[PDB]
Write a protein that binds this ligand. Structure first.
Ligand code: HEM
Ligand code: HEM
Ligand SMILES: C[C@H](O)[C@H](O)[C@H]1CNc2nc(N)[nH]c(=O)c2N1
Ligand SMILES: C[C@H](O)[C@H](O)[C@H]1CNc2nc(N)[nH]c(=O)c2N1
Ligand SMILES: N=C(NO)NCCC[C@H](N)C(=O)O
Ligand SMILES: N=C(NO)NCCC[C@H](N)C(=O)O
Ligand SMILES: [Zn+2]
Lengths: 411, 413
């Protein structure tokens, strides 16, 4: 019930007590560990304990636990749930709640930054055009000419579940994917389906390798509409290598702003179905995953060939050599254009420090080791050697179904 | 518990269905509210033993297509009588073999399990003394080594009786290098083995105090105090490590041994406990090139290698550590291959593991696997295992951790 975690490199032991505050399920049981599975409206009665759980932590955090201000608020919210079946967060509660969803994000290595989050309150939004305006402002604010700043933009909460706000895009900025008669895929194969939805809805696709996709925005449960982010708001970086002059001829670019837009933010039982957020990239995200996953841009072979490595045998480690070089190029390119990026060494040692702070001041830090350890050079990063406990704390970011599987089209 | 559990591979969209987990019996360290997936380490009664014996022998008899047979029923009767009368029982040779193979088949942290049915089992249950254990262990090493053409094997010493007469190998592996803490706080040799090296010295080993000294065997028989033995050097196959392009690599002075032989685990078969059960396969290169050489708390050669490569070491973002890592790993695979000693690279091993795992789902209904251990410690996502969802659970027979015997031994003196 009080749990120890060991770092096997430093022999440091931390004691976790925060896990006892954990509320929802992990996926696992006593008999079966599901640590590596990617994916393992509320009635009045459901809502009040959740509202209360949240307000208590809020009031505790501002050192007014058990105060009249505290008691006053619980009653006010109580009355409001009873009368209107939902409630509205104060701005202070909204900001605290968003910062804490990030703080509690077990899969995010960058949480040392958690309290420096710009929160844009878009709860007054009513239309998809409004949503477009809001999202452009977020993109421009967070991009900040390459000196990126963390931000989240929060659209109105779910009500009856028939008036949901949604960003159909999985990130605000991503590249199109197109199935070819050639049998192959042009662009990013992760986005084939979504691209096709855009086309069905009217988009005129350029049909290139790196077409920034349009926004498909859904307000108040209505049908989604298309918008193009002003090109001048989308900062992109051409990818070159500091030693290989041929690298630029591969014709690779990526975007500077990673902005997850398909998750659900839960605060105090309230569900914010449209809550796009952004920080900045860890290099491996692009260089290892986006570029080298076989089901993504899958570029290892092309690169290995230009390096003229021995590709006849796996044991020459040609894949490993090429992987490192692709990742060097990513970091060098972002750095040279002054676009914020963090390498996996820097990011993981910051995370270990954050864990130690969180253990010290909070009693723990939920972490998913499977996601936190980078997808290259794992054991030469400190997090590989760190035992971590994964559990679910609220406020939280949650996965939610892709809206086209569920949207009841009006036509 | 749900009858069916699905696992998906996110590279291929292949979905597999696990039913085998229903035969899982012991616990994980996980609860409904906590996942302890990344945590390293989270005598029996007559009553406790009957059912464990029974479960096992039903599995054994089922596997040989003789389930429910008179032979099956006689054998159950015989074991039941043996347990009631003697408090324990003895396995038949065929059952010991099947047992050991299955402990390997069920080892969720082993990526080499495509090999599980090809295992040489050495029955050392007639062993009574530490000199006897030395001789069994020498034979295992020579057989397994096979002049570089490595053969998987296990040597099984007598099972636990009352817990006061345990056979133990005090070494963590049959072959490993000494570590020596210096008065200045540096370590000469392998820091992982500093504690065991001090024990050996105390027991009377005359340490050469070099960087790669093969440790002596420290063997406990029948609950007696451990005794020291030197493995004949002619039996210890080692590989000097060089790089195919960097002729300075050899002057690092690195080598390693060819035979990885875990010697400190406990093998459970039908409720019986084999506390001494050294087993060996062959190396996947990363064990040596990533962990043994490059962990900060092991040989820690990254800086020295990067220095000789003249990488830019002022900023992590040059990925100099990463670049040196790959070159060290090329060198390990190249050196072993050049000397004709079996080694597998992490690409080939993981590809084979995924093939093995698919086959096990079809023919067996499952394959328990611990992702944290199965994914290699470099280049994780360019191996297929990274993209494969895994279910980790405990099947018996099993290999299990046990405390270090120096923490528990009652010294006779
Ligand atoms: C500030 C710099 C940040 C860095 C360096 C960072 C780093 C990362 C990385 C490397 C991942 C793994 C993503 C993947 O593998 O696809 C991740 C996931 C995640 N992060 Fe962050 N992050 C940052 C900002 C944020 C912010 C601002 C939030 C929320 C406001 C956040 C919440 C999350 C969540 C909820 C996940 C899991 C997403 C999923 O399951 O797909 N992160 N983070
Ligand atoms: C034949 C070639 C083999 C290969 C390539 C192989 C591969 C591996 C690797 C890479 C690990 C992780 C070790 C570490 O990170 O320290 C491992 C662990 C393990 N393997 Fe194997 N193995 C082989 C043979 C065997 C055999 C013959 C057995 C038993 C008969 C076995 C049972 C185990 C067990 C119980 C573990 C967990 C060890 C621990 O928890 O410290 N392996 N294997
Ligand atoms: C199956 C397994 O969960 C999957 O491949 C995971 C592995 N760890 C991850 N880690 C991060 N950061 N991002 C991911 O997408 C993955 N995917
Ligand atoms: C804390 C974490 O479990 C620990 O460092 C693990 C990680 N995965 C591993 N994987 C393998 N194969 N071998 C190990 O020793 C480790 N150690
Ligand atoms: N660093 C972040 N967010 O701030 N990553 C968000 C997910 C991005 C996704 N991994 C990609 O490579 O596009
Ligand atoms: N492949 C095996 N056995 O066959 N590994 C056993 C553990 C070896 C340990 N990882 C080492 O590097 O010494
Ligand atoms: Zn688990």
């Amino acid at each position: 019930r009080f749990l120890k975690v060991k770092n096997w490199e430093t022999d440091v032991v931390l004691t976790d007590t925060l896990h006892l505050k954990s509320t929802l399920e992990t996926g696992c049981t006593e008999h079966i560990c599901m640590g590596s599975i990617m994916l393992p409206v509320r009635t009045k009665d459901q809502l009040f304990p959740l509202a209360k759980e949240f307000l208590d932590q809020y009031y505790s955090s501002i050192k007014r636990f058990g105060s009249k201000a505290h008691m006053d608020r619980l009653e006010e919210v109580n009355k409001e749930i009873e009368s209107t079946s939902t409630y509205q967060l104060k701005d202070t509660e909204l900001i605290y709640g968003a910062k804490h969803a990030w703080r509690n994000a077990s899969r995010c290595v960058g949480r040392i930054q958690w309290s420096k989050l710009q929160v844009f309150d878009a709860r007054d939004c009513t239309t998809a055009h409004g949503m477009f305006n809001y999202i452009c402002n977020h993109v421009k604010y967070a991009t900040n000419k390459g000196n990126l700043r963390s931000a989240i933009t929060i659209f109105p909460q779910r009500t009856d579940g028939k008036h949901d706000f949604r960003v159909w895009n999985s990130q605000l900025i991503r590249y199109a994917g197109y199935k070819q008669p050639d049998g192959s895929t042009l662009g990013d194969p992760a986005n084939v389906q979504f691209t096709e939805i855009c086309i069905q809805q009217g988009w005129k696709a350029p049909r290139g390798r790196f077409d920034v996709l349009p926004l498909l925005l859904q307000a108040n449960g209505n049908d989604p509409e298309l918008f193009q982010i002003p090109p001048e708001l989308v900062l992109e970086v051409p990818i070159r290598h500091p030693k290989f002059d041929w690298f630029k001829d591969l014709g690779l670019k990526w975007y500077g702003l990673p902005a997850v837009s398909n998750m659900l933010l839960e605060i105090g039982g309230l569900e914010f179905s449209a809550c796009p957020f952004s920080g900045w990239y860890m290099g491996t995200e692009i260089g290892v995953r986006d570029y080298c996953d076989n089901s993504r841009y899958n570029i290892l072979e092309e690169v290995a060939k230009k390096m003229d490595l021995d590709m006849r045998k796996t044991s020459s480690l040609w894949k490993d050599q090429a992987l490192v070089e692709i990742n060097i190029a990513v970091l060098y390119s972002f750095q040279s254009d002054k676009v914020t990026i963090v390498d996996h060494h820097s990011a993981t040692e910051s995370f270990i420090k954050h864990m130690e702070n969180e253990y010290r001041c909070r009693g723990g830090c939920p972490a998913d080791w499977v996601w936190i350890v980078p997808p290259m050079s794992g054991s030469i990063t400190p997090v590989f050697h760190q035992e971590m406990l994964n559990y679910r704390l609220t406020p939280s970011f949650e996965y939610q179904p892709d809206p086209w599987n569920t949207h009841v089209w009006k036509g």
